[PDB]
Amino acid sequence: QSMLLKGQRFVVTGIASKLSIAWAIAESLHREGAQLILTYPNDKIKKRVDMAAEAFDAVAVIECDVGSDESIQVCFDEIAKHWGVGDDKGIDGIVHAIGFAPADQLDGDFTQATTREGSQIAHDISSYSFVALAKAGRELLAARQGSLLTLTYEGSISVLPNYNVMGMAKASLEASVRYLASSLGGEGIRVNAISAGPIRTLAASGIKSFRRMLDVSEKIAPLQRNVSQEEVGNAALFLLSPWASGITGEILFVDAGFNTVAISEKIM
Amino acid sequence: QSMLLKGQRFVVTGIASKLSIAWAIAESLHREGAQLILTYPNDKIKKRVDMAAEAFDAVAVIECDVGSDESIQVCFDEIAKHWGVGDDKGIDGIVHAIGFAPADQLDGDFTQATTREGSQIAHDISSYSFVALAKAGRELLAARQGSLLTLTYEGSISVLPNYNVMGMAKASLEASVRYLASSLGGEGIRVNAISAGPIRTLAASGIKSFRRMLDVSEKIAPLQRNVSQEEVGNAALFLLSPWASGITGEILFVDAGFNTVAISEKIMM
Amino acid sequence: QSMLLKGQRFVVTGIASKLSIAWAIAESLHREGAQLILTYPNDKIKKRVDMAAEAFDAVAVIECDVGSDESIQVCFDEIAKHWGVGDDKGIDGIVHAIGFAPADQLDGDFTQATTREGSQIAHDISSYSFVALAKAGRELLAARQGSLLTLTYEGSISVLPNYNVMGMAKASLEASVRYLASSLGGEGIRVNAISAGPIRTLAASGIKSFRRMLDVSEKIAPLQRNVSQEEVGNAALFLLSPWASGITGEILFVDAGFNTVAISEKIMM
Amino acid sequence: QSMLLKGQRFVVTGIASKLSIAWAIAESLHREGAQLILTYPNDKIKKRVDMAAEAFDAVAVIECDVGSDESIQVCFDEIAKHWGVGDDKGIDGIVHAIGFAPADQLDGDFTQATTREGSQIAHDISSYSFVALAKAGRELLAARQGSLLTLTYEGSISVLPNYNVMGMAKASLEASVRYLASSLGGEGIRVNAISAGPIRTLAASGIKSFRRMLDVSEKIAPLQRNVSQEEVGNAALFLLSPWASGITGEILFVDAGFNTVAISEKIM
Ligand SMILES: NC(=O)c1ccc[n+]([C@@H]2O[C@H](COP(=O)([O-])OP(=O)(O)OC[C@H]3O[C@@H](n4cnc5c(N)ncnc54)[C@H](O)[C@@H]3O)[C@@H](O)[C@H]2O)c1
Ligand SMILES: NC(=O)c1ccc[n+]([C@@H]2O[C@H](COP(=O)([O-])OP(=O)(O)OC[C@H]3O[C@@H](n4cnc5c(N)ncnc54)[C@H](O)[C@@H]3O)[C@@H](O)[C@H]2O)c1
Ligand SMILES: NC(=O)c1ccc[n+]([C@@H]2O[C@H](COP(=O)([O-])OP(=O)(O)OC[C@H]3O[C@@H](n4cnc5c(N)ncnc54)[C@H](O)[C@@H]3O)[C@@H](O)[C@H]2O)c1
Ligand SMILES: NC(=O)c1ccc[n+]([C@@H]2O[C@H](COP(=O)([O-])OP(=O)(O)OC[C@H]3O[C@@H](n4cnc5c(N)ncnc54)[C@H](O)[C@@H]3O)[C@@H](O)[C@H]2O)c1
Ligand SMILES: Oc1cc(Cl)ccc1Oc1ccc(Cl)cc1Cl
Ligand SMILES: Oc1cc(Cl)ccc1Oc1ccc(Cl)cc1Cl
Ligand SMILES: Oc1cc(Cl)ccc1Oc1ccc(Cl)cc1Cl
Ligand SMILES: Oc1cc(Cl)ccc1Oc1ccc(Cl)cc1Cl
Ligand SMILES: [Ca+2]
Ligand SMILES: [Ca+2]
């Protein structure tokens, strides 16, 4: 409870449950005195975004299915009504916390499991959607010299069992972080990612052997534990804050050091 | 002219002209005594693949538009007729040398220029196609314990003007190199990539400011020059050869050292 | 002026002038309500550390030449007197902001300029010193579950003119960040680095063509500018703070995005 | 047995036994028709270098303790007698296959085990020695537009138990690959490294849990096995060959894919 984001405004995608990393990012931003707009992709998920809206006193709760150009365009329309008008216009940040590939893509042998359409959807929802948000948000961001933040996973650069086409999408996503940074930096907009360690979330639960992943990680990670959503929330807060004014194009690992260790006493 | 690939067989995609990197890869494999099957995506491009078939005495010239599952499945059917059968069955390698994004994606400001469909096509043709080839060729490869090779570019990990959506696709492609390696290694199949520096090819010609890119590169690269197609051909030959038996999941830079320099003396120029 | 480091304690090396990156790190920690101990390697430099002691109300100003095991051991003795004792014992962080190689190592052609002793001194003062601080400070750090922070430069992973032996030392330093993280993590100690872009500091001033380096950087960096000491100070504050509790072994670039660009439009200039 | 290095000359350091990676590199170069000069750091090790000299018909066997400027200067003196004179002067390559840190540095907890002098020696012998060879060899290399090759290990960029200060040295070494490449490229000299997976060698045997490292690696590596010295030999041959004319500053992993996998069914 400091007051680092007093009067700052953020759009937060990807809340699905109390376990969502985006939930904790919202919580961190709210704690620090920012105002929030929260998005949801459909009615089932709206139920849970509404709970988050209540807990964080969201300014609005707007539909945003990042699969639709119409949905995104309309969503940023609504946001502009609230935050695009009058004396203090603009937004300080947009949080992209959205991943999807069809479940079959992440079940078993990579070459067997990957399909043309699976790949298409994985890249579209998990990677292009970040640039889609940047396109719709550009002017709002430029007005306040805000930043974009996405979430990635080590699966982009190292192989983790079953991660498969999501690895291809995350690698694609991370390239976009760099291209957007180069594209938007001249307007004072920063673009960054957090590479989170494994955390029990709705999506996480869906991956074969994720539980085992969680166990192994704890035994590899220098801190001898996994990270919590709160720890990613705080790191996100930093990157979204004026304190990160010199940082763009950056991938920040929040994984208890996991990415730095090839083998531990897994040996034993 | 050594004889390092005597009696070995390779499928080579991506020949579009005498300037194609894939042309030089074919040339290197042929020089070393390998047999080739060459593929073409359409009739216009067949004209030039046929010239390469003549120069390299290709075993066959088969249609392969990597945008179509049908086209790929048919293509690897044809290749199975030639190479799938008998006591000598299998292929030693498949060379993926195919990139595409709609031209508009690579024209100016990244955020402005990138579109949902542009992205879709870029990843589909430039990245997924590599796994598509691995899927169709797996059995043929396993029979000889062959390898796959693709071509990437530094645009995956560093920003280069206009490269844009192709950078996203190349990053995706490189992740697939790693996933395919993990997936196919237990069947003795290796999967690798070459990150070539900039070279004047038909696709290269089409990128705004490519000529200028070429000029700056020459002044940044430790060897004070750009690489030729032949130098990529030779490196590809190595990775496709039994000499690279211990190497998989690898990205090998053939860029005269360009990727290792942040700034050169040019500090002046 | 928030109060994020209320009642936290930090040791800050590497203040040599008002321009030092370590000066701004001290300033950020003080601004946020932390107490500081500041170190100096010799009497000439003490003059400037004393000015920083006045501005930031340092708890103490202690000698610490990281070239001497004795000097370090004595220094951490003194700091233990102040901060080692009682129900509040321990330190929240140690800031390593020390680089040195003999000037001749950084003057021109790398192979010509690098010497056995130059290399020895560069690694000893620039890299081993970080583990030296971790060894002397381990117990104090563990008591509060604090962290170590060093400063590196892209010269470790990419070539920059004249950086030379300092590039070898920084690469070594970054490996130590990882080994220390692995070694100390089980005691709840985090170990991280900031890779700062180029900034006019006393050491920076001494590098041939640094001014030119600064000019090109500004034209390559996505933000179209260089960073200030303050921006490194703020990022350092974060990594030293409880907000970075889940982050260890990390190299965080604070360079306005410079490291992510291979070539900009400058293709022209 | 092709004839790719006909009439080419290479200096090969680091032969200590038949298990030395440098042994197999010599073997690969000889097989392909190159002539070799072999070096040894002292009399004990000379016994084994002499066996290699017999097997590969070395042109000379010269002393080179890379700890001494005198020793290196004298060594390259002798080499110049053989290969620096007359019509066809120069060398096509120098193979650096030398690592050392005092044994205590690699036994147990990194922070406990590392010492000021241990670090000094590790960097001096394992990293500076590569530039020392480049300095002494520059003119011989430039005459034939030869290349330098060193050997590194993933320990530089990822943590492996006990590798410790050798990790710091290897990271330093790899930076030197890049600096030397930049420095010498204008004279047509290339500079590269191979990052070999774990292989049973004299030095390897000396590291606590190396045997376990070997076991774990086999279960992580995509090829489901470790690499042999021969496979590194062949890759070294390529990098030292005219076929690698476009390649400088490169780290080439010869590790059966190990570096690319964060976790396998170590999970199981
Ligand atoms: N260990 C981990 O859980 C972990 C680690 C690193 C990265 N990540 C990344 O974190 C981000 C958030 O995921 P999470 O782990 O908190 O899981 P989660 O299930 O809480 O969040 C995933 C979100 O994606 C949203 N989404 C899916 N398709 C959408 C669409 N078409 N339009 C809009 N939203 C859509 C879902 O509604 C959901 O809120 C993802 O990008 C994920 O890949 C997760
Ligand atoms: N500087 C460079 O030229 C450079 C640098 C590194 C990477 N590469 C990569 O090397 C590969 C070859 O490109 P190039 O420079 O030799 O140019 P090129 O124009 O010769 O090759 C591109 C090839 O892709 C083919 N292709 C496009 N869509 C296809 C489809 N649907 N089905 C089948 N083939 C299709 C074209 O027919 C053509 O042969 C590409 O992956 C490219 O991105 C090029
Ligand atoms: N552009 C930049 O300025 C830049 C970029 C990134 C990295 N860094 C790193 O940041 C750190 C601080 O450098 P700076 O640029 O602020 O310059 P500076 O000249 O202010 O700092 C270098 C410091 O090292 C100290 N030092 C040297 N030998 C010492 C010894 N034996 N014992 C104790 N202290 C000793 C000097 O007293 C001085 O305070 C260094 O590690 C430097 O390499 C600087
Ligand atoms: N798994 C592995 O064995 C492995 C993997 C990757 C990297 N490497 C690297 O391979 C290289 C060769 O080592 P190896 O594994 O074949 O072991 P090895 O014991 O066969 O070779 C090490 C060599 O270093 C030499 N050396 C040590 N100090 C010297 C000095 N002062 N002057 C000259 N020579 C000196 C020794 O005489 C010996 O020949 C080393 O650089 C090593 O770090 C080894
Ligand atoms: O990327 C992730 C990485 C981890 Cl370790 C855990 C959860 C993740 O998030 C996802 C994983 C798969 C799918 Cl289909 C969608 C999402 Cl959001
Ligand atoms: O990847 C490349 C990199 C460079 Cl430097 C030059 C050409 C390249 O190849 C392409 C670039 C754009 C498109 Cl649309 C298609 C292809 Cl094949
Ligand atoms: O690492 C640095 C990087 C830059 Cl861009 C500028 C200054 C740096 O700091 C040093 C450079 C050389 C020496 Cl001898 C000592 C120090 Cl502190
Ligand atoms: O670097 C190596 C890496 C591995 Cl996995 C195995 C052996 C290696 O080589 C050495 C390791 C330690 C020391 Cl003291 C000296 C050398 Cl030559
Ligand atoms: Ca980082
Ligand atoms: Ca490589």
Side-chain angles (χ1 to χ4, degrees), chain D residues 14-16 20-22 41 45 64-67 97-100 125 151-153 163 170 196-199 201-204 210:
Chain D
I15 296 172
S20 289
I21 294 170
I45 301 305
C64 196
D65 167 2
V66 290
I98 293 160
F100 184 84
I125 301 302
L151 296 165
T152 190
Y153 183 57
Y163 201 60
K170 285 300 182 183
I199 302 171
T201 71
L202 187 68
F210 171 81

mmCIF file of all heavy atoms in Angstrom, chain D residues 14-16 20-22 41 45 64-67 97-100 125 151-153 163 170 196-199 201-204 210, ligand 4:
data_model
loop_
_atom_site.group_PDB
_atom_site.id
_atom_site.type_symbol
_atom_site.label_atom_id
_atom_site.label_comp_id
_atom_site.label_asym_id
_atom_site.label_seq_id
_atom_site.Cartn_x
_atom_site.Cartn_y
_atom_site.Cartn_z
ATOM 1 N N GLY D 14 45.872 -29.136 -25.891
ATOM 2 C CA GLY D 14 44.891 -29.781 -25.036
ATOM 3 C C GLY D 14 44.793 -31.311 -25.145
ATOM 4 O O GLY D 14 43.892 -31.907 -24.543
ATOM 5 N N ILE D 15 45.701 -31.963 -25.885
ATOM 6 C CA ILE D 15 45.756 -33.423 -25.820
ATOM 7 C C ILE D 15 46.377 -33.833 -24.482
ATOM 8 O O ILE D 15 47.482 -33.394 -24.166
ATOM 9 C CB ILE D 15 46.500 -34.039 -27.022
ATOM 10 C CG1 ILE D 15 45.768 -33.777 -28.339
ATOM 11 C CG2 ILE D 15 46.712 -35.530 -26.808
ATOM 12 C CD1 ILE D 15 46.555 -34.199 -29.571
ATOM 13 N N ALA D 16 45.642 -34.624 -23.683
ATOM 14 C CA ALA D 16 46.169 -35.156 -22.429
ATOM 15 C C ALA D 16 46.109 -36.686 -22.371
ATOM 16 O O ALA D 16 46.869 -37.303 -21.626
ATOM 17 C CB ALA D 16 45.447 -34.575 -21.243
ATOM 18 N N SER D 20 40.819 -37.176 -24.548
ATOM 19 C CA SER D 20 40.788 -35.730 -24.738
ATOM 20 C C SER D 20 39.923 -35.392 -25.944
ATOM 21 O O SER D 20 40.024 -36.035 -26.980
ATOM 22 C CB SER D 20 42.166 -35.159 -24.923
ATOM 23 O OG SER D 20 42.880 -35.219 -23.698
ATOM 24 N N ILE D 21 39.086 -34.358 -25.820
ATOM 25 C CA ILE D 21 38.357 -33.925 -26.997
ATOM 26 C C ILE D 21 39.367 -33.559 -28.095
ATOM 27 O O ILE D 21 39.147 -33.869 -29.268
ATOM 28 C CB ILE D 21 37.412 -32.766 -26.634
ATOM 29 C CG1 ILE D 21 36.302 -33.232 -25.689
ATOM 30 C CG2 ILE D 21 36.848 -32.121 -27.898
ATOM 31 C CD1 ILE D 21 35.476 -32.103 -25.097
ATOM 32 N N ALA D 22 40.495 -32.949 -27.692
ATOM 33 C CA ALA D 22 41.522 -32.516 -28.631
ATOM 34 C C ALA D 22 42.127 -33.710 -29.374
ATOM 35 O O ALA D 22 42.579 -33.576 -30.513
ATOM 36 C CB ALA D 22 42.593 -31.732 -27.902
ATOM 37 N N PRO D 41 51.804 -29.129 -22.071
ATOM 38 C CA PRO D 41 52.186 -28.180 -21.028
ATOM 39 C C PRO D 41 53.332 -28.589 -20.108
ATOM 40 O O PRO D 41 53.896 -27.715 -19.470
ATOM 41 C CB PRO D 41 50.883 -28.014 -20.229
ATOM 42 C CG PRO D 41 50.201 -29.351 -20.366
ATOM 43 C CD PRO D 41 50.585 -29.878 -21.730
ATOM 44 N N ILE D 45 52.581 -34.806 -19.283
ATOM 45 C CA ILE D 45 51.585 -34.798 -20.356
ATOM 46 C C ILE D 45 52.231 -35.075 -21.719
ATOM 47 O O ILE D 45 51.555 -35.562 -22.625
ATOM 48 C CB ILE D 45 50.737 -33.509 -20.334
ATOM 49 C CG1 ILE D 45 49.994 -33.358 -19.001
ATOM 50 C CG2 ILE D 45 49.808 -33.408 -21.546
ATOM 51 C CD1 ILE D 45 49.142 -34.548 -18.625
ATOM 52 N N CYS D 64 54.047 -25.894 -24.644
ATOM 53 C CA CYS D 64 53.216 -24.707 -24.538
ATOM 54 C C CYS D 64 52.402 -24.787 -23.258
ATOM 55 O O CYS D 64 51.360 -25.431 -23.212
ATOM 56 C CB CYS D 64 52.285 -24.546 -25.733
ATOM 57 S SG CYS D 64 51.592 -22.872 -25.868
ATOM 58 N N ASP D 65 52.923 -24.139 -22.223
ATOM 59 C CA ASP D 65 52.208 -23.923 -20.979
ATOM 60 C C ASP D 65 51.588 -22.534 -21.086
ATOM 61 O O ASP D 65 52.308 -21.544 -21.078
ATOM 62 C CB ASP D 65 53.189 -24.004 -19.805
ATOM 63 C CG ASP D 65 52.632 -23.502 -18.485
ATOM 64 O OD1 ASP D 65 51.453 -23.117 -18.456
ATOM 65 O OD2 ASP D 65 53.396 -23.455 -17.511
ATOM 66 N N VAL D 66 50.259 -22.474 -21.228
ATOM 67 C CA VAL D 66 49.623 -21.215 -21.589
ATOM 68 C C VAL D 66 49.607 -20.259 -20.398
ATOM 69 O O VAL D 66 49.144 -19.133 -20.520
ATOM 70 C CB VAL D 66 48.228 -21.404 -22.239
ATOM 71 C CG1 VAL D 66 48.299 -22.015 -23.643
ATOM 72 C CG2 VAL D 66 47.219 -22.137 -21.348
ATOM 73 N N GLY D 67 50.153 -20.688 -19.257
ATOM 74 C CA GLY D 67 50.367 -19.837 -18.091
ATOM 75 C C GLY D 67 51.571 -18.905 -18.232
ATOM 76 O O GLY D 67 51.694 -17.926 -17.490
ATOM 77 N N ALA D 97 42.023 -26.060 -26.613
ATOM 78 C CA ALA D 97 41.237 -27.065 -25.909
ATOM 79 C C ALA D 97 41.799 -27.236 -24.504
ATOM 80 O O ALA D 97 42.228 -28.318 -24.119
ATOM 81 C CB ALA D 97 41.223 -28.369 -26.687
ATOM 82 N N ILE D 98 41.792 -26.139 -23.757
ATOM 83 C CA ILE D 98 42.474 -26.013 -22.484
ATOM 84 C C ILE D 98 41.513 -25.352 -21.505
ATOM 85 O O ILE D 98 41.000 -24.259 -21.757
ATOM 86 C CB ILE D 98 43.727 -25.130 -22.670
ATOM 87 C CG1 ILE D 98 44.777 -25.820 -23.555
ATOM 88 C CG2 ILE D 98 44.296 -24.668 -21.334
ATOM 89 C CD1 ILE D 98 45.762 -24.844 -24.134
ATOM 90 N N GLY D 99 41.312 -26.031 -20.385
ATOM 91 C CA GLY D 99 40.604 -25.493 -19.244
ATOM 92 C C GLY D 99 41.379 -25.876 -17.996
ATOM 93 O O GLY D 99 42.021 -26.921 -17.966
ATOM 94 N N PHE D 100 41.389 -24.970 -17.015
ATOM 95 C CA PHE D 100 41.857 -25.292 -15.679
ATOM 96 C C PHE D 100 41.301 -24.281 -14.669
ATOM 97 O O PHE D 100 41.297 -23.072 -14.913
ATOM 98 C CB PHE D 100 43.391 -25.418 -15.626
ATOM 99 C CG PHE D 100 43.860 -25.847 -14.261
ATOM 100 C CD1 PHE D 100 43.889 -27.192 -13.906
ATOM 101 C CD2 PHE D 100 44.163 -24.899 -13.293
ATOM 102 C CE1 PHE D 100 44.264 -27.574 -12.622
ATOM 103 C CE2 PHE D 100 44.532 -25.275 -12.011
ATOM 104 C CZ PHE D 100 44.581 -26.614 -11.675
ATOM 105 N N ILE D 125 43.981 -19.261 -17.121
ATOM 106 C CA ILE D 125 44.277 -20.478 -17.878
ATOM 107 C C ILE D 125 43.152 -20.782 -18.862
ATOM 108 O O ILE D 125 43.440 -21.271 -19.957
ATOM 109 C CB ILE D 125 44.586 -21.693 -16.961
ATOM 110 C CG1 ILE D 125 45.792 -21.430 -16.040
ATOM 111 C CG2 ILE D 125 44.771 -22.974 -17.771
ATOM 112 C CD1 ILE D 125 47.075 -21.091 -16.797
ATOM 113 N N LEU D 151 36.913 -24.456 -27.020
ATOM 114 C CA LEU D 151 35.814 -25.292 -26.559
ATOM 115 C C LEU D 151 35.211 -24.655 -25.319
ATOM 116 O O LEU D 151 35.942 -24.243 -24.409
ATOM 117 C CB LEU D 151 36.299 -26.724 -26.279
ATOM 118 C CG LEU D 151 36.803 -27.476 -27.515
ATOM 119 C CD1 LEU D 151 37.581 -28.708 -27.105
ATOM 120 C CD2 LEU D 151 35.659 -27.847 -28.449
ATOM 121 N N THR D 152 33.871 -24.591 -25.310
ATOM 122 C CA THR D 152 33.182 -24.043 -24.154
ATOM 123 C C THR D 152 32.159 -25.064 -23.649
ATOM 124 O O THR D 152 32.041 -26.186 -24.167
ATOM 125 C CB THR D 152 32.639 -22.631 -24.426
ATOM 126 O OG1 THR D 152 32.165 -22.039 -23.204
ATOM 127 C CG2 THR D 152 31.528 -22.654 -25.462
ATOM 128 N N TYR D 153 31.418 -24.636 -22.623
ATOM 129 C CA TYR D 153 30.420 -25.467 -21.986
ATOM 130 C C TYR D 153 29.223 -24.605 -21.569
ATOM 131 O O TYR D 153 29.386 -23.458 -21.167
ATOM 132 C CB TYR D 153 31.046 -26.219 -20.804
ATOM 133 C CG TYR D 153 30.079 -27.165 -20.136
ATOM 134 C CD1 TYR D 153 29.470 -28.165 -20.892
ATOM 135 C CD2 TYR D 153 29.745 -27.055 -18.786
ATOM 136 C CE1 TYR D 153 28.543 -29.024 -20.335
ATOM 137 C CE2 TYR D 153 28.812 -27.917 -18.210
ATOM 138 C CZ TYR D 153 28.193 -28.884 -19.000
ATOM 139 O OH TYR D 153 27.272 -29.776 -18.514
ATOM 140 N N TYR D 163 30.152 -26.496 -11.282
ATOM 141 C CA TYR D 163 30.939 -25.932 -12.369
ATOM 142 C C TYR D 163 31.583 -24.607 -11.967
ATOM 143 O O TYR D 163 32.712 -24.329 -12.362
ATOM 144 C CB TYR D 163 30.146 -25.821 -13.669
ATOM 145 C CG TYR D 163 31.011 -25.726 -14.900
ATOM 146 C CD1 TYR D 163 31.896 -26.736 -15.233
ATOM 147 C CD2 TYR D 163 30.954 -24.625 -15.735
ATOM 148 C CE1 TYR D 163 32.689 -26.669 -16.372
ATOM 149 C CE2 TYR D 163 31.716 -24.553 -16.890
ATOM 150 C CZ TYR D 163 32.601 -25.573 -17.213
ATOM 151 O OH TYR D 163 33.373 -25.493 -18.348
ATOM 152 N N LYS D 170 34.291 -19.567 -18.606
ATOM 153 C CA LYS D 170 33.772 -19.945 -19.924
ATOM 154 C C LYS D 170 32.969 -18.788 -20.526
ATOM 155 O O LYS D 170 33.025 -18.539 -21.732
ATOM 156 C CB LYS D 170 32.944 -21.238 -19.852
ATOM 157 C CG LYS D 170 33.755 -22.528 -19.699
ATOM 158 C CD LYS D 170 34.747 -22.811 -20.829
ATOM 159 C CE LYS D 170 35.493 -24.129 -20.672
ATOM 160 N NZ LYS D 170 36.486 -24.303 -21.755
ATOM 161 N N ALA D 196 30.453 -28.129 -26.216
ATOM 162 C CA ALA D 196 30.255 -29.570 -26.203
ATOM 163 C C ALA D 196 29.364 -29.972 -25.025
ATOM 164 O O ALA D 196 29.451 -29.403 -23.930
ATOM 165 C CB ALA D 196 31.589 -30.277 -26.124
ATOM 166 N N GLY D 197 28.502 -30.969 -25.249
ATOM 167 C CA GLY D 197 27.842 -31.626 -24.129
ATOM 168 C C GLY D 197 28.856 -32.313 -23.215
ATOM 169 O O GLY D 197 30.051 -32.285 -23.495
ATOM 170 N N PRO D 198 28.444 -32.919 -22.075
ATOM 171 C CA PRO D 198 29.378 -33.626 -21.201
ATOM 172 C C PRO D 198 29.922 -34.896 -21.863
ATOM 173 O O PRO D 198 29.188 -35.635 -22.522
ATOM 174 C CB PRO D 198 28.538 -33.977 -19.957
ATOM 175 C CG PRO D 198 27.100 -33.942 -20.436
ATOM 176 C CD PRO D 198 27.057 -32.945 -21.580
ATOM 177 N N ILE D 199 31.240 -35.101 -21.710
ATOM 178 C CA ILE D 199 31.961 -36.222 -22.282
ATOM 179 C C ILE D 199 32.992 -36.664 -21.245
ATOM 180 O O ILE D 199 33.645 -35.807 -20.647
ATOM 181 C CB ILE D 199 32.659 -35.811 -23.601
ATOM 182 C CG1 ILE D 199 31.687 -35.281 -24.661
ATOM 183 C CG2 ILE D 199 33.477 -36.973 -24.151
ATOM 184 C CD1 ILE D 199 32.374 -34.675 -25.863
ATOM 185 N N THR D 201 36.194 -37.294 -19.945
ATOM 186 C CA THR D 201 37.580 -36.978 -20.259
ATOM 187 C C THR D 201 38.299 -36.874 -18.923
ATOM 188 O O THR D 201 37.661 -36.890 -17.874
ATOM 189 C CB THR D 201 37.744 -35.653 -21.034
ATOM 190 O OG1 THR D 201 37.445 -34.599 -20.123
ATOM 191 C CG2 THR D 201 36.866 -35.548 -22.261
ATOM 192 N N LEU D 202 39.611 -36.711 -18.977
ATOM 193 C CA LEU D 202 40.384 -36.663 -17.755
ATOM 194 C C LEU D 202 39.837 -35.559 -16.859
ATOM 195 O O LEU D 202 39.513 -35.818 -15.702
ATOM 196 C CB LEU D 202 41.834 -36.387 -18.142
ATOM 197 C CG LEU D 202 42.825 -36.463 -16.996
ATOM 198 C CD1 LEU D 202 42.931 -37.918 -16.535
ATOM 199 C CD2 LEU D 202 44.175 -35.911 -17.447
ATOM 200 N N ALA D 203 39.737 -34.329 -17.397
ATOM 201 C CA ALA D 203 39.255 -33.194 -16.616
ATOM 202 C C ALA D 203 37.825 -33.445 -16.144
ATOM 203 O O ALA D 203 37.500 -33.209 -14.990
ATOM 204 C CB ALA D 203 39.346 -31.923 -17.417
ATOM 205 N N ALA D 204 36.974 -33.934 -17.046
ATOM 206 C CA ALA D 204 35.580 -34.185 -16.728
ATOM 207 C C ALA D 204 35.457 -35.068 -15.478
ATOM 208 O O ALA D 204 34.711 -34.723 -14.547
ATOM 209 C CB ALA D 204 34.881 -34.759 -17.930
ATOM 210 N N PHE D 210 29.938 -35.377 -11.910
ATOM 211 C CA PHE D 210 30.011 -35.399 -13.365
ATOM 212 C C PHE D 210 29.356 -36.663 -13.930
ATOM 213 O O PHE D 210 28.669 -36.619 -14.956
ATOM 214 C CB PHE D 210 31.428 -35.175 -13.905
ATOM 215 C CG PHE D 210 31.485 -35.423 -15.389
ATOM 216 C CD1 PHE D 210 31.072 -34.442 -16.278
ATOM 217 C CD2 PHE D 210 31.858 -36.664 -15.897
ATOM 218 C CE1 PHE D 210 31.063 -34.681 -17.645
ATOM 219 C CE2 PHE D 210 31.858 -36.899 -17.264
ATOM 220 C CZ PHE D 210 31.452 -35.909 -18.134
HETATM 221 N N1 LIG E 4 32.335 -32.722 -21.186
HETATM 222 C C1 LIG E 4 33.564 -32.283 -21.418
HETATM 223 O O1 LIG E 4 34.561 -32.985 -21.193
HETATM 224 C C2 LIG E 4 33.709 -30.866 -21.958
HETATM 225 C C3 LIG E 4 32.554 -30.211 -22.417
HETATM 226 C C4 LIG E 4 32.627 -28.915 -22.875
HETATM 227 C C5 LIG E 4 33.827 -28.232 -22.809
HETATM 228 N N2 LIG E 4 34.970 -28.868 -22.500
HETATM 229 C C6 LIG E 4 36.253 -28.164 -22.749
HETATM 230 O O2 LIG E 4 37.077 -28.999 -23.572
HETATM 231 C C7 LIG E 4 38.444 -28.566 -23.437
HETATM 232 C C8 LIG E 4 39.342 -29.780 -23.403
HETATM 233 O O3 LIG E 4 39.095 -30.518 -22.184
HETATM 234 P P1 LIG E 4 38.711 -32.075 -22.144
HETATM 235 O O4 LIG E 4 37.343 -32.285 -21.623
HETATM 236 O O5 LIG E 4 39.023 -32.747 -23.436
HETATM 237 O O6 LIG E 4 39.710 -32.511 -20.976
HETATM 238 P P2 LIG E 4 41.268 -32.915 -21.001
HETATM 239 O O7 LIG E 4 41.703 -33.151 -19.586
HETATM 240 O O8 LIG E 4 41.505 -33.951 -22.040
HETATM 241 O O9 LIG E 4 41.885 -31.557 -21.565
HETATM 242 C C9 LIG E 4 42.150 -30.390 -20.767
HETATM 243 C C10 LIG E 4 43.490 -29.937 -21.255
HETATM 244 O O10 LIG E 4 43.892 -28.661 -20.678
HETATM 245 C C11 LIG E 4 45.295 -28.718 -20.658
HETATM 246 N N3 LIG E 4 45.891 -27.640 -19.885
HETATM 247 C C12 LIG E 4 45.635 -27.338 -18.573
HETATM 248 N N4 LIG E 4 46.391 -26.365 -18.121
HETATM 249 C C13 LIG E 4 47.221 -26.030 -19.180
HETATM 250 C C14 LIG E 4 48.244 -25.075 -19.318
HETATM 251 N N5 LIG E 4 48.649 -24.280 -18.328
HETATM 252 N N6 LIG E 4 48.883 -25.003 -20.515
HETATM 253 C C15 LIG E 4 48.484 -25.811 -21.506
HETATM 254 N N7 LIG E 4 47.545 -26.754 -21.486
HETATM 255 C C16 LIG E 4 46.937 -26.821 -20.275
HETATM 256 C C17 LIG E 4 45.574 -30.112 -20.089
HETATM 257 O O11 LIG E 4 46.926 -30.465 -20.271
HETATM 258 C C18 LIG E 4 44.610 -30.948 -20.936
HETATM 259 O O12 LIG E 4 45.190 -31.461 -22.137
HETATM 260 C C19 LIG E 4 38.461 -27.697 -22.175
HETATM 261 O O13 LIG E 4 38.542 -26.321 -22.499
HETATM 262 C C20 LIG E 4 37.120 -28.024 -21.510
HETATM 263 O O14 LIG E 4 36.747 -27.020 -20.578
HETATM 264 C C21 LIG E 4 34.929 -30.175 -22.007
#
